[PDB]
Design an enzyme around this catalytic site. Structure first.
Site, PDB file in Angstrom:
ATOM      1  N   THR E   1      -9.534   7.219  -3.437  1.00 61.15           N
ATOM      2  CA  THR E   1      -8.073   7.374  -3.400  1.00 61.15           C
ATOM      3  C   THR E   1      -7.606   8.809  -3.120  1.00 61.15           C
ATOM      4  O   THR E   1      -8.119   9.764  -3.692  1.00 61.15           O
ATOM      5  CB  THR E   1      -7.369   6.941  -4.695  1.00 61.15           C
ATOM      6  OG1 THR E   1      -7.691   5.569  -4.854  1.00 61.15           O
ATOM      7  CG2 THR E   1      -5.857   7.073  -4.658  1.00 61.15           C
ATOM      8  N   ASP E  17      -3.248   6.737   0.595  1.00 64.04           N
ATOM      9  CA  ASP E  17      -4.153   5.963   1.446  1.00 64.04           C
ATOM     10  C   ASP E  17      -4.154   4.489   0.947  1.00 64.04           C
ATOM     11  O   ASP E  17      -3.400   4.158   0.018  1.00 64.04           O
ATOM     12  CB  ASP E  17      -5.578   6.548   1.457  1.00 64.04           C
ATOM     13  CG  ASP E  17      -6.382   6.159   0.233  1.00 64.04           C
ATOM     14  OD1 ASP E  17      -5.868   6.372  -0.903  1.00 64.04           O
ATOM     15  OD2 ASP E  17      -7.500   5.580   0.380  1.00 64.04           O
ATOM     16  N   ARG E  19      -7.300   2.379   0.700  1.00 63.88           N
ATOM     17  CA  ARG E  19      -8.627   1.902   0.278  1.00 63.88           C
ATOM     18  C   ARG E  19      -8.771   1.721  -1.216  1.00 63.88           C
ATOM     19  O   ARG E  19      -8.445   2.612  -2.014  1.00 63.88           O
ATOM     20  CB  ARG E  19      -9.717   2.870   0.774  1.00 63.88           C
ATOM     21  CG  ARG E  19     -11.147   2.418   0.467  1.00 63.88           C
ATOM     22  CD  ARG E  19     -12.165   3.406   1.041  1.00 63.88           C
ATOM     23  NE  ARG E  19     -12.236   3.289   2.481  1.00 63.88           N
ATOM     24  CZ  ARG E  19     -13.142   3.903   3.267  1.00 63.88           C
ATOM     25  NH1 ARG E  19     -14.082   4.690   2.751  1.00 63.88           N
ATOM     26  NH2 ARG E  19     -13.123   3.694   4.567  1.00 63.88           N
ATOM     27  N   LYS E  33      -0.567   1.530  -2.944  1.00 65.76           N
ATOM     28  CA  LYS E  33      -0.718   2.440  -4.070  1.00 65.76           C
ATOM     29  C   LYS E  33       0.587   3.152  -4.504  1.00 65.76           C
ATOM     30  O   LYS E  33       0.579   3.881  -5.481  1.00 65.76           O
ATOM     31  CB  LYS E  33      -1.779   3.465  -3.735  1.00 65.76           C
ATOM     32  CG  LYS E  33      -3.119   2.848  -3.422  1.00 65.76           C
ATOM     33  CD  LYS E  33      -4.194   3.902  -3.253  1.00 65.76           C
ATOM     34  CE  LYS E  33      -5.415   3.270  -2.611  1.00 65.76           C
ATOM     35  NZ  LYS E  33      -6.504   4.260  -2.463  1.00 65.76           N
ATOM     36  N   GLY E  47      -7.141   6.009  -9.873  1.00 68.58           N
ATOM     37  CA  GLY E  47      -7.990   5.738 -11.017  1.00 68.58           C
ATOM     38  C   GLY E  47      -8.302   4.255 -11.067  1.00 68.58           C
ATOM     39  O   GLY E  47      -8.601   3.629 -10.031  1.00 68.58           O
ATOM     40  N   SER E 129      -9.923  10.959  -5.705  1.00 73.95           N
ATOM     41  CA  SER E 129     -11.146  11.591  -5.208  1.00 73.95           C
ATOM     42  C   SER E 129     -10.901  12.439  -3.944  1.00 73.95           C
ATOM     43  O   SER E 129     -11.694  13.335  -3.665  1.00 73.95           O
ATOM     44  CB  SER E 129     -12.278  10.572  -4.998  1.00 73.95           C
ATOM     45  OG  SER E 129     -11.834   9.526  -4.127  1.00 73.95           O
ATOM     46  N   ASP E 166     -13.153  12.284   2.279  1.00 72.74           N
ATOM     47  CA  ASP E 166     -13.558  11.653   1.038  1.00 72.74           C
ATOM     48  C   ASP E 166     -13.994  10.204   1.340  1.00 72.74           C
ATOM     49  O   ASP E 166     -13.251   9.392   1.942  1.00 72.74           O
ATOM     50  CB  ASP E 166     -12.386  11.684   0.016  1.00 72.74           C
ATOM     51  CG  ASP E 166     -12.627  10.804  -1.213  1.00 72.74           C
ATOM     52  OD1 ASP E 166     -13.751  10.787  -1.785  1.00 72.74           O
ATOM     53  OD2 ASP E 166     -11.656  10.120  -1.662  1.00 72.74           O
ATOM     54  N   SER E 169     -11.716   7.331   0.118  1.00 73.64           N
ATOM     55  CA  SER E 169     -10.410   7.157   0.715  1.00 73.64           C
ATOM     56  C   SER E 169     -10.525   6.623   2.106  1.00 73.64           C
ATOM     57  O   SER E 169     -11.480   6.911   2.812  1.00 73.64           O
ATOM     58  CB  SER E 169      -9.609   8.491   0.728  1.00 73.64           C
ATOM     59  OG  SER E 169      -9.434   8.993  -0.594  1.00 73.64           O
TER      60      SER E 169
HETATM   61  C1  LIG Z   1      -8.670   5.202  -5.851  1.00 74.12           C
HETATM   62  O1  LIG Z   1      -8.433   5.925  -7.069  1.00 74.12           O
HETATM   63  C2  LIG Z   1      -8.395   3.733  -6.183  1.00 74.12           C
HETATM   64  C3  LIG Z   1      -6.943   3.487  -6.658  1.00 74.12           C
HETATM   65  C4  LIG Z   1      -6.642   2.026  -7.010  1.00 74.12           C
HETATM   66  C5  LIG Z   1      -5.230   1.938  -7.597  1.00 74.12           C
HETATM   67  C6  LIG Z   1      -6.770   1.136  -5.799  1.00 74.12           C
HETATM   68  N1  LIG Z   1      -9.314   3.307  -7.201  1.00 74.12           N
HETATM   69  C7  LIG Z   1     -10.172   2.299  -7.041  1.00 74.12           C
HETATM   70  O2  LIG Z   1     -10.361   1.640  -6.028  1.00 74.12           O
HETATM   71  C8  LIG Z   1     -11.006   2.028  -8.252  1.00 74.12           C
HETATM   72  C9  LIG Z   1     -12.019   3.184  -8.274  1.00 74.12           C
HETATM   73  O3  LIG Z   1     -12.975   2.706  -9.220  1.00 74.12           O
HETATM   74  N2  LIG Z   1     -11.563   0.677  -8.281  1.00 74.12           N
HETATM   75  C10 LIG Z   1     -11.185  -0.269  -9.166  1.00 74.12           C
HETATM   76  O4  LIG Z   1     -10.371  -0.112 -10.106  1.00 74.12           O
HETATM   77  C11 LIG Z   1     -11.879  -1.612  -9.101  1.00 74.12           C
HETATM   78  C12 LIG Z   1     -10.890  -2.641  -8.646  1.00 74.12           C
HETATM   79  C13 LIG Z   1     -10.863  -2.611  -7.122  1.00 74.12           C
HETATM   80  C14 LIG Z   1     -10.853  -4.011  -6.521  1.00 74.12           C
HETATM   81  C15 LIG Z   1      -9.504  -4.636  -6.157  1.00 74.12           C
HETATM   82  C16 LIG Z   1      -9.275  -5.953  -6.921  1.00 74.12           C
HETATM   83  C17 LIG Z   1      -8.319  -3.670  -6.412  1.00 74.12           C
HETATM   84  C18 LIG Z   1     -10.112   5.537  -5.326  1.00 74.12           C
HETATM   85  C19 LIG Z   1     -10.198   7.007  -4.756  1.00 74.12           C
HETATM   86  O5  LIG Z   1     -11.063   5.478  -6.403  1.00 74.12           O
HETATM   87  C20 LIG Z   1     -10.647   4.537  -4.277  1.00 74.12           C
HETATM   88  O6  LIG Z   1     -12.024   4.822  -3.958  1.00 74.12           O
END
Ligand SMILES: *[C@@](O)([C@H](CC(C)C)NC(=O)[C@H](CO)NC(=O)CCCCC(C)C)[C@@](C)(O)CO
Ligand SMILES: [Cl-]
Ligand SMILES: [Cl-]
Ligand SMILES: [Cl-]
Ligand SMILES: [Cl-]
Ligand SMILES: [Cl-]
Ligand SMILES: [Cl-]
Ligand SMILES: [Cl-]
Ligand SMILES: [Cl-]
Ligand SMILES: [Cl-]
Ligand SMILES: [Cl-]
Ligand SMILES: [Cl-]
Ligand SMILES: [Cl-]
Ligand SMILES: [Cl-]
Ligand SMILES: [Cl-]
Ligand SMILES: [Cl-]
Ligand SMILES: [Cl-]
Ligand SMILES: [Cl-]
Ligand SMILES: [K+]
Lengths: 244, 248, 239, 234, 220, 230, 233, 237
Positions: E1, E17, E19, E33, E47, E129, E166, E169
């Site tokens: 993120t 972003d 992802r 997001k 997070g 990240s 990153d 992202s």
């Molecule tokens: C982001 O922080 C991203 C933000 C989130 C609000 C989409 N975080 C995640 O993707 C986290 C990182 O562990 N993943 C989850 O909470 C698992 C659930 C994801 C699966 C879907 C049902 C949402 C980044 C920088 O961490 C993304 O890499």
């Protein structure tokens, strides 16, 4: 109907056959037991609260006899009715305001503080085990958009904002005096606010006050902090009035 | 506080429970509601009290409630009290299904709710619920069933019964016309209309003023339907044609 | 009937249970307080109901903090309960804020506790009125009085109990603003002797306490020799 | 009338009838006497026996080494209060390793017994106590009431016909401070004997004695052990 | 993120972003997001995804109750307080890292809010990240009082820095522009990443898959 | 503590008189009107507004619950504020779970259930209010009333408060199925004029409307416009 | 109507006074303490020949060294009896010794005024117990008989009757009791007195009798042992 | 929670709620029990008849466990609460003791439940009496009765409900070694006892039996009317 009664409807807050709450009605009579009247008026620039100050006993420390209270730096109030009930309601208001600021990061609006106190009073009209408080609260403060505010709440949990209002023994007479005065005024708004308040109180009581027989509190757009007038400040208003 | 407590859960000198008896007087004044069991199904038919011209019509019925896949009920008495109980019936039925993974048998649902009503007559110092209920259902233990419960927490099973306004008269008419072991849904429908026609004696009977629901079994599944107004007027027509035959 | 619960207003807006509690205070013998230039002095007409009691029994003067005295009238078990509430409030204030409770704040906090017993069928109002007195260099002399309704005010002079009005009229004769605690004790004793009804209630002890510059802001019993001199002055002044 | 069933209802005269009624429970108990000298505190109690074949009700109870009580009124309330006192004494020895001062214990009783006089559906305690104790401030006799008031006494009597005992005690109280123990107990017995019908006398069956002082832990004397004190009422 | 925000002359620009990851696998290519708080307040989340969703939803809901009561437009400080007090109470166990921006009666305000409950009121912030990549862009190029289009360019540049540098992202750039007069929720703002095209066709005809059992159930 | 016994009980004839008496408080309240048009709903009410001294804008009788649901009442104002607060809270609790605005009928059922509680629960009286609740969902307008018993009803048009019996017959001889919202606003204000006494201004009536765009109060200037014809 | 903890103008709790009046609706029981042991005797009060007389149990074992006879509202006595049993077993558990008769009686008597409707748990005692009890046993003080009533007052007695005919029976007990009386004399005396006061003709099935002696544990008399004692009486 | 004292003493030592609960029992349908030599029998009146009733759903005789059953008279909703509580308790006993309950054990339990509802805040007493029957481990047959006060006793035979006085009088004269020498006569003794008080005899006697080890058998109207004729034609002689 017409003053009918069944069961315990004069002892607790249940409905009479006409749909009245006698115990709530009786809390309004309790407001007058104190024998005092209060007035409040708002203009474009300020809001003012005026109340009688009766010190019959010479042995009283008269600096401790007041019905004016700071709720926050910017919100003042006048209390009318049973004294200990009034103090309790002032404590509650102070608590509600402080809690609002802590939780939300900005000062409680006067309308919201008045609503909250009214909502608390509502509970005493629906639950049987406690009485209503036999007091009435008038709040003043400056709202950044709407300007000076005057709000009043009562033992029934009713509340409203006002151009001007009154409480206590001569409430009705004060209401007539204030009504007649605003109709004359352009855009139905008071302009000389401290003088209207004192004149109203002096007419409905027939007294012509000394500066030690009233208390005056103010908030203004230029100076929003609640301020209590001194004797000399009050005297200047009494003398300016006497001379036209 | 002892002065204000009306003591809703105590006995009177003759071993009576006054609040229960008084709640039963409330029920006697409410809309007439009957249930009739047949070989191929069960029905509920109820007088509507929501009949002013300006009402809007938004739900599929006024006093007939689905409880789960295999059961429905109707109510006579205080409506808001009925909404509390029928909500509780639905909960009980889902708690059973959660636990056992099969539908609650009809009598078990009735009994569970009756135990709540009973508690309100014995402790807690509250007014009882001012509701009687007719329950229709199918289960795999006793097939098609009809139950009645009242504010004492008492219930019974019936082949046919009535609650609410003119109950006593309705039951006499059922006693005389009901054929134990020989009724069909079509003849139970005819009898329901006959009975309501006599017990709504203020005044002439109309589809706008009654509500009928049927419970049947089709292809291993329970079907609960509220008859449309077209069908209700047709049954009223047939009853009126039938009374033209009555002499010669 | 409209007078059985503190949660019931009468049709005229009175709370009779609070008024009845006030009548218990008004049946009690008299206590007075007087604020002066450099402190506060308390006096109590303490009726001795049996000669079998010890001198000192049933005190009506209490220390509620090191700087705060309390003088009571009315039902004595209720008054002692309030003294304990006042003590707990002073103690808790010191623990939380780190300094001696200001008198006015102590008065207001205990008054709100009294007030809480005037709203409910579940409890009854306190049958007592009490005065609180203190002195410090920063705040000067302060004297507050609290009644069964929970009203609290400050005073130059104050009297509670059955000869309240007679006491007040004698107190009004003193220019107390310009007198010292040592002068005022004699006048407190004098006033108690004046309002005491020597025909109707036969025997009393005078109880005296003070707080002021002369005690360094500590509430203390008046010393025995000074009390006896004040009594002797009061008795001879009666003449 | 409308004012006499609830401890929370003030009468229009500023009285609480339930408290006054509770005090009648003590006035109808059998009499007990308490008195003190410079060195000892004594309790003397008449015990009522239901029939000729019953033992006679205990009237004097141990609280701690330095404290004992005599009771009048509801016995079950007396035990509840005595158990509270015992526990307060045990707490003080546990925490501070010293006896609870008698005046502090009496304050705790005042505070405990006041509470139910102010809450709906509670009742006063229907018992009055005479409390004998010895601490750093010497001997004490205290009296406690159903009103939650208490009194510090030179001597006292409560219970039925205790007015006579009180009159004797006033008559002789200038002698008590200088009495030896035997003289002081004799005075207690003569006071108690004033409460009796003219026919009847003090006996080993109806008198109970409690004593504490400088050299003496709280001790109860009953039955054959009261005889030394009764002989020589000459 | 990668999430970010800026205060410009007349308002706030928020960026994010799209992802979401589970471990080192992309689970969502087009996650949203930038979350609604009130009509004048939005919040980007980084997070733990369930925690950012649920936390912003709850506060938005409590704020609607607040505004319904007051009859006034909510303040950004109020959202900030509500969020931080809840996050503090949970001691960092609610893994919501937030960029809160809006415009109220006192003008534009931007806050970063951390999982343990600290907040920083600043004219530009980044989280996720990708946050150091995005912050490098801001430190190099931010000026006070930018015009709307400059601010939008800067935020999307910053998000792009995180997207491309990153591994956490990716995919699209979303922006939200908030002023006194306007709310522009721009989803997507830019689509700098595109799946390549398929070169061979794998259109499997009926009967390719062998079937053991079949049941057709007709419906109404 | 709280009294744990019911203050509403059955009389020998089977009546819950406290509920009847709560209805008499409603009947003596200021008039309220609701009309369901084909494309929306209007709610209107009279202010029991004496003095020129009142700031008419300071408290409202017509209130939003959600973007798409609004309320008015007849009876006791402070009781109403309780129900407004609970309705708003109920609507948000639904939204948090389902992520869809609460259907009007679902909101009415939950609010009516709170009113039922106060007819049975310990140491409390019933609410002295009846509510008129409007909403729009599933492409269609809804008008409901909820009474002090907790009974609720769906209406095409109705009246409550003072002179309601007459107001209902006035609407009976005046409402039609195919009526538009702008026409409905007019007939709602005429219904209030039937029992007004005072001369109507935009400052002593309050009007709310509900359509596909959502629920909102009409402004003083909009009400003034409708009042020119009346 | 007034609360359950209301004092009368004479300083008594109405509820307790009324509970004491309920004891007078009970069958008569008698206790006698001798230097050789205590006996407890009770009228069964059979109301139908269809009733099983052995199902009336108005004398119960508390422990091996302690029995208890009851009169009044018998259903009320069950929780008191169970408390006595549990207390003596707790005392054994904790101290490895038998509990005194006086101590058992005291433990039970501390339940007596524990009723009321706004101090206590969600459904605590609403009223006093309509029961009187005689505890008879042997401990290191020797044989002992204690009486307890619904006020929570308890006291040692040399001989005591309770229930309907207790005045009457108490008078005959004053006449016949002496401190040096044997147990066998005490047993005979109490059956002679029950015989006078009972409405029915006394026999071996409509009374119960038990003893406790320094030698010997709590012992309920059998039909055959009652018949033996009944011959002389 | 509601903590009002409901059952209190009145002057003269009465507990009025309990006396009123007993009035409720006296207006219930008559129920009768007899303890045989190796059978126990329960029979109960009526209550209503009513052709449109499903008979199964209103029985007044109930299994508590395999070896214990009961009949009641009084408030039927109250009885259902007591019965279910006793059924739970029978399963706890089996769980912790690994024997079925004795009839006296479960009686004692039911009685103490009833007694508690005469001495607990916020509750009224149960308006029922019960007749409880079965067999102990060693084959001994048992018949107990409980009433609203919590008092209980064992009986050779007994009746509760309306007309219990006269049914008890009949049993006192008719219960002998001869009348219970066999199973058929024990059953008849119960039917004769009912058929005294039973309105339109009968028709509306419900009847059940329990044999040593053999679990509860309820009789059907055809098996009942066999007994009715077999006694009625004997009473001509
Ligand atoms: C982001 O922080 C991203 C933000 C989130 C609000 C989409 N975080 C995640 O993707 C986290 C990182 O562990 N993943 C989850 O909470 C698992 C659930 C994801 C699966 C879907 C049902 C949402 C980044 C920088 O961490 C993304 O890499
Ligand atoms: Cl703050
Ligand atoms: Cl002006
Ligand atoms: Cl289902
Ligand atoms: Cl299901
Ligand atoms: Cl006074
Ligand atoms: Cl005594
Ligand atoms: Cl006693
Ligand atoms: Cl006293
Ligand atoms: Cl006395
Ligand atoms: Cl902040
Ligand atoms: Cl309660
Ligand atoms: Cl709100
Ligand atoms: Cl919503
Ligand atoms: Cl709006
Ligand atoms: Cl007795
Ligand atoms: Cl239980
Ligand atoms: Cl019976
Ligand atoms: K109230």
């Amino acid at each position: 109907s017409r003053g009918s009664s069944a069961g315990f409807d004069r002892h607790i807050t249940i409905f009479s056959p006409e749909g009245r709450l006698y115990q709530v009605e009786y809390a309004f009579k309790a407001i007058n037991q104190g024998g005092l009247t209060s007035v409040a008026v708002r203009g474009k620039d300020c809001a003012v609260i005026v109340t009688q100050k009766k010190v019959p006993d010479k042995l009283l420390d008269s600096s401790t006899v007041t019905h004016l209270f700071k709720i926050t730096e910017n919100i003042g109030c006048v209390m009318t009715g049973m004294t200990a009930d009034s103090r309790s309601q002032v404590q509650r208001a102070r608590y509600e305001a402080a809690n609002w600021k802590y939780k939300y990061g900005y000062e409680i609006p006067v309308d919201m503080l008045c609503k909250r106190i009214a909502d608390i009073s509502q509970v005493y009209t629906q639950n049987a085990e406690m009485r209503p408080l036999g007091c009435c609260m008038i709040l003043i403060g400056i709202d950044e958009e709407q300007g000076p505010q005057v709000y009043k709440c009562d033992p029934a949990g009713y509340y409203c904002g006002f151009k001007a209002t009154a409480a206590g023994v001569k409430q009705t007479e004060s209401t007539s005096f204030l009504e007649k005065k605003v109709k004359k005024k352009f855009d139905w708004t008071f302009e000389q606010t401290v003088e209207t308040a004192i004149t109203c109180l002096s007419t409905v009581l027939s007294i012509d006050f000394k500066p030690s027989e009233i208390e005056v509190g103010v908030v203004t757009v230029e100076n929003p902090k609640f301020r209590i007038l001194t004797e000399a400040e009050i005297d200047a208003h009494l003398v300016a009035l006497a001379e036209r | 506080s002892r002065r204000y407590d009306s003591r809703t859960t105590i006995f009177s000198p003759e071993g009576r429970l006054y609040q229960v008896e008084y709640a039963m007087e409330a029920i006697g004044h409410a809309g007439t509601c009957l249930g009739i069991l047949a070989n191929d199904g069960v029905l509920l038919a109820a007088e509507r009290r929501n009949i002013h011209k300006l009402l809007d019509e938004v739900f599929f019925s006024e006093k007939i409630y689905k409880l789960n896949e295999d059961m429905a009920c109707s109510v006579a008495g205080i409506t808001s009290d009925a909404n509390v109980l029928t909500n509780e019936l639905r909960l009980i039925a889902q708690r059973y299904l959660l636990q056992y993974q099969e539908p609650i048998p009809c009598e078990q649902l009735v009994t569970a709710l009756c135990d709540i009503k009973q508690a309100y007559t014995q402790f807690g110092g509250k007014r009882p619920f001012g509701v009687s209920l007719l329950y229709i259902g199918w289960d795999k233990h006793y097939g098609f069933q009809l139950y009645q419960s009242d504010p004492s927490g008492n219930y019974g099973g019936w082949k046919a019964t009535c609650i609410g306004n003119n109950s006593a008269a309705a039951v006499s008419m059922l006693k005389q016309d009901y054929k134990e072991g020989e009724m069909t849904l079509k003849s139970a429908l005819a009898l329901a209309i006959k009975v309501l026609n006599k017990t709504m004696d203020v005044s002439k009977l109309s589809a706008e003023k009654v509500e009928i629901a049927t419970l049947t079994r089709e292809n291993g599944k329970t079907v609960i339907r509220v008859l449309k107004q077209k069908e209700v007027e047709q049954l009223i027509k047939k009853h009126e044609e039938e009374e033209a035959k009555a002499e010669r | 009937g409209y007078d059985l619960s503190a949660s019931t207003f009468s049709p005229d807006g009175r709370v009779f249970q609070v008024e009845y509690a006030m009548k218990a205070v008004e049946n009690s013998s008299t206590a007075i307080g007087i604020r002066c230039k450099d402190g506060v002095v308390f006096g109590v007409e303490k009726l001795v109901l049996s000669k079998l009691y010890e001198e000192g029994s049933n005190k009506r003067l209490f220390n509620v903090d090191r700087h705060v005295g309390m003088a009571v009238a009315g039902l004595l078990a209720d008054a002692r309960s309030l003294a304990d509430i006042a003590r707990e409030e002073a103690s808790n204030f010191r623990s939380n804020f780190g300094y001696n409770i200001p008198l006015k704040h102590l008065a207001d906090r205990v008054a709100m506790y009294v007030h809480a017993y005037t709203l409910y069928s579940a409890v009854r109002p306190f049958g007592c009125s009490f005065m609180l007195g203190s002195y410090s260099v920063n705040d000067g002399a302060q004297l507050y009085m609290i009644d069964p309704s929970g009203v609290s005010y400050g005073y130059w002079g104050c009297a509670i109990g059955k000869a309240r009005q007679a006491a007040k009229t004698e107190i009004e004769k003193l220019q107390m603003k310009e007198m010292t605690c040592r002068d005022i004790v004699k006048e407190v004793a004098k006033i108690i002797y004046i309002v005491h009804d020597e025909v109707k209630d036969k025997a009393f002890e005078l109880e005296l306490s003070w707080v002021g510059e002369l005690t360094n802001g500590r509430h203390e019993i008046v010393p025995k020799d000074i009390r006896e001199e004040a009594e002797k002055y009061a008795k001879e002044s009666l003449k | 009338n409308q004012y006499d069933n609830d401890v929370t209802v003030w009468s229009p005269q500023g009285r609480i009838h339930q408290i006054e009624y509770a005090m009648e429970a003590v006035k109808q108990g059998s009499a007990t006497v308490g008195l003190k000298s410079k060195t000892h505190a004594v309790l003397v109690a008449l015990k009522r026996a239901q029939s000729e074949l019953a033992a006679h009700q205990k009237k004097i109870l141990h609280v701690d080494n330095h404290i004992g009580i005599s009771i009048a009124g509801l016995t079950a309330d007396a035990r509840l209060l005595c158990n509270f006192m015992r526990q307060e004494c045990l707490d003080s020895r546990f925490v501070f390793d010293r006896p609870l001062p008698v005046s502090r214990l009496v304050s705790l009783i005042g505070s405990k017994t006041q509470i139910p006089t102010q809450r709906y559906g509670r009742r006063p305690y229907g018992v009055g106590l005479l409390i004998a104790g010895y601490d750093d401030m010497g001997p004490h006799i205290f009296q406690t009431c159903p009103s939650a008031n208490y009194f510090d006494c030179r001597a006292m009597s409560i219970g039925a016909r205790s007015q006579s005992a009180r009159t004797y005690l006033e008559r002789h109280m200038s002698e008590f401070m200088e009495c030896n123990l035997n003289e002081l107990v004799k005075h207690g017995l003569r006071a108690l004997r004033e409460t009796l019908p003219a026919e009847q006398d003090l006996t080993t069956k109806n008198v109970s004695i409690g004593i504490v002082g400088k050299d003496l832990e709280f001790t109860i004397y009953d039955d054959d052990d009261v005889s030394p004190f009764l002989e020589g009422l000459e | 993120t990668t999430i970010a925000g800026v205060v410009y002359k007349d308002g706030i620009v928020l960026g994010a972003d799209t992802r979401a990851t589970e471990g080192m696998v992309v689970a969502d290519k087009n996650c949203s997001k930038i979350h609604f708080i009130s009509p004048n307040i939005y919040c980007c989340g980084a997070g733990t995804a369930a925690d950012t969703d649920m936390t912003t939803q709850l506060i938005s809901s409590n704020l609607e109750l607040h505004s319904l009561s007051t009859g006034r437009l909510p303040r950004v400080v109020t959202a900030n307080r509500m969020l931080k007090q809840m996050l503090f109470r949970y001691q960092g166990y609610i893994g919501a890292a937030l960029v809160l921006g809006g415009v109220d009666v006192t003008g534009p305000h931007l806050y970063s809010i951390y999982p343990h409950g600290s907040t920083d009121k600043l004219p530009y912030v980044t989280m996720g990240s990708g946050s150091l990549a995005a912050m490098a862009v801001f430190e190099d190029k931010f000026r006070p009082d930018m015009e709307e289009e400059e601010a939008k360019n800067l935020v999307s540049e910053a998000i792009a820095a995180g997207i491309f540098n990153d591994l956490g992202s990716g995919s699209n750039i979303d922006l939200c522009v908030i002023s006194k007069n306007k709310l522009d929720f721009l989803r997507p703002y830019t689509v700098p990443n595109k799946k390549g095209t398929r070169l061979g066709r794998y259109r499997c005809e009926k009967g390719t898959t062998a079937v053991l059992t079949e049941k057709i159930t007709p419906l109404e | 503590r709280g009294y744990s016994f019911s203050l509403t009980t059955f009389s020998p004839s089977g009546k819950l008189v406290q509920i009847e008496y709560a209805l008499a408080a409603v009947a003596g309240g200021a008039p309220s009107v609701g009309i369901k048009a084909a494309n929306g709903v209007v709610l209107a009410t009279e202010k029991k507004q004496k003095s020129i001294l009142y700031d008419e804008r300071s408290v409202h009788k017509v209130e939003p619950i959600t973007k798409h649901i609004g309320l008015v009442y007849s009876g006791m104002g402070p009781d109403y504020r309780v129900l407004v607060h609970r309705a708003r809270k109920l609507a948000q609790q639904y939204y948090l779970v389902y992520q869809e605005p609460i259907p009007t009928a679902q909101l009415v059922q939950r609010v009516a259930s709170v009113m039922q509680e106060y007819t049975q629960s310990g140491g409390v009286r019933p609410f002295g209010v009846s509510l008129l609740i409007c909403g729009w969902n599933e492409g269609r307008p809804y008008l409901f009333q909820s009474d002090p018993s907790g009974a609720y009803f769906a209406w095409k048009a109705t009246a409550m408060g003072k002179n309601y019996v007459n107001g209902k017959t006035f609407l009976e001889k005046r409402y039609n199925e195919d009526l538009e919202l702008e026409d409905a606003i007019h007939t709602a204000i005429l219904t209030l004029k039937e029992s007004f006494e005072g001369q109507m201004t935009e400052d002593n009536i309050e009007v709310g409307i509900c359509n596909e765009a959502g629920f909102r109060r009409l402004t003083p200037t909009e009400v003034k416009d409708y009042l020119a014809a009346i | 109507d007034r609360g359950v903890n209301t004092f009368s103008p004479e300083g008594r709790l109405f509820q307790v006074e009324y509970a004491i009046e309920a004891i007078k609706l009970g069958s008569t029981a008698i206790g006698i303490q001798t230097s050789e042991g205590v006996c407890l005797a009770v009228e069964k009060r059979i109301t139908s020949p269809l009733m099983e007389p052995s199902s009336i149990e108005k004398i119960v074992e508390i422990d091996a060294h302690i029995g208890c006879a009851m009169s009044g509202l018998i259903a009320d006595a069950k929780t008191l009896i169970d408390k006595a049993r549990v207390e003596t077993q707790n005392h054994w558990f904790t101290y490895n010794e038998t509990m005194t008769v006086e101590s058992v009686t005291q433990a039970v008597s501390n339940l007596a005024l524990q009723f009321g409707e706004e101090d206590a748990d969600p459904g605590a005692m609403s009223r006093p117990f309509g029961v009187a009890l005689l505890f008879g046993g042997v401990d290191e003080k020797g044989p002992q008989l204690f009486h307890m009533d619904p006020s929570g007052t308890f006291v040692q007695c040399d001989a005591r009757a309770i229930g309907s005919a207790s005045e009457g029976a108490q008078s005959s007990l004053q006449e016949v009791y002496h401190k040096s009386m044997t147990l066998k004399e005490a047993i005979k005396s109490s059956l002679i007195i029950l015989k006078q006061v009972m409405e029915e003709k006394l026999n071996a099935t409509n009374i119960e009798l038990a003893t406790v002696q320094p030698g010997q544990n709590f012992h309920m008399f059998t039909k055959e042992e009652l018949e033996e004692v009944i011959k002389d009486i | 929670s509601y903590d009002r004292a409901i059952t209190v003493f009145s002057p003269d030592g009465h507990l009025f709620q309990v006396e009123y609960a007993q009035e409720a029992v006296k207006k219930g349908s008559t129920a009768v029990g007899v303890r045989g030599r190796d059978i126990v029998v329960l029979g109960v009146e009526k209550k209503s008849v009513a052709k449109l009733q499903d008979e199964r759903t209103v029985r007044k005789i109930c299994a508590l466990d395999d070896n214990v059953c009961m009949a009641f008279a009084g408030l039927t909703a109250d009885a259902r609460i007591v019965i279910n509580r006793a059924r739970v308790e029978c399963q706890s006993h089996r769980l912790t003791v690994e024997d079925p309950v004795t009839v006296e054990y479960i009686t004692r339990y039911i009685a103490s439940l009833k007694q508690r509802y005469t001495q607990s805040n916020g509750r009224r007493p149960f308006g029922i009496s019960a007749l409880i029957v079965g067999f102990d481990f060693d084959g001994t047959p048992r018949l107990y009765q409980t009433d609203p006060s919590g008092t209980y006793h064992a009986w050779k035979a007994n009746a509760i409900g309306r007309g219990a006085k006269s049914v008890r009088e009949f049993l006192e004269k008719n219960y002998t070694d001869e009348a219970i020498e066999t199973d058929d006569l024990t059953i008849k003794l119960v039917i004769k006892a009912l058929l005294e008080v039973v309105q339109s005899g009968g028709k509306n006697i419900e009847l059940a039996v329990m044999r040593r080890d053999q679990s509860l058998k309820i009789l059907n109207p055809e098996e009942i009317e066999k007994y009715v004729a077999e006694i009625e034609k004997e009473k001509e002689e």
